[PDB]
Amino acid sequence: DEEDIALEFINGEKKDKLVNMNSFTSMFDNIQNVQMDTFFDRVMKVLT
């Protein structure tokens, strides 16, 4: 059953977003006077 539990571990994975060369290039126009935790959430919306 060890091959079956290995298949269930590599089966229990979700589609997660990757960083590209041009994912965070649209943060420079709105790093101006926004707060750091709003910026962090702005990053997390891209990462998820």
């Binding site: 290039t25 649209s26 420079f28 126009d29």
Partner: protein
């Protein structure tokens, strides 16, 4: 009658004398038209002002034929606002490039 016209016509809607002389002798047509004095084309600098006059005429044809052809229109500016956000981030991404090498 503005709503049933294509977006390239909405681009060159003002510059007809330059357009039609540059078509009846095989020259290069104008690119701005009456849409030159829009705020985004004022924000653009160079030949990407002709580029964003093209994208602004496309989005303005979208918003304007939705205006004249909707029935349950809400007078809220939603379509114009999402189109203007599209044009703004397009303009930002072709002002961020620079043809100099670093």
């Amino acid at each position: 009658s503005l709503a049933k016209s294509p977006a390239s016509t909405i681009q060159i809607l003002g510059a007809e004398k330059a357009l039609f002389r540059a078509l009846k002798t095989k020259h290069d047509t104008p690119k701005y038209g009456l849409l030159y004095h829009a705020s985004l084309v004022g924000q653009a600098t160079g030949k990407n002002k002709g580029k964003i006059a093209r994208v602004l005429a496309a989005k303005a044809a979208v918003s304007l034929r939705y205006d004249a052809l909707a029935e349950d229109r809400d007078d809220s500016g939603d379509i114009g606002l999402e189109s203007r956000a599209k044009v703004e981030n397009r303009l930002s991404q072709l002002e961020g490039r620079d043809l100099r090498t670093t």
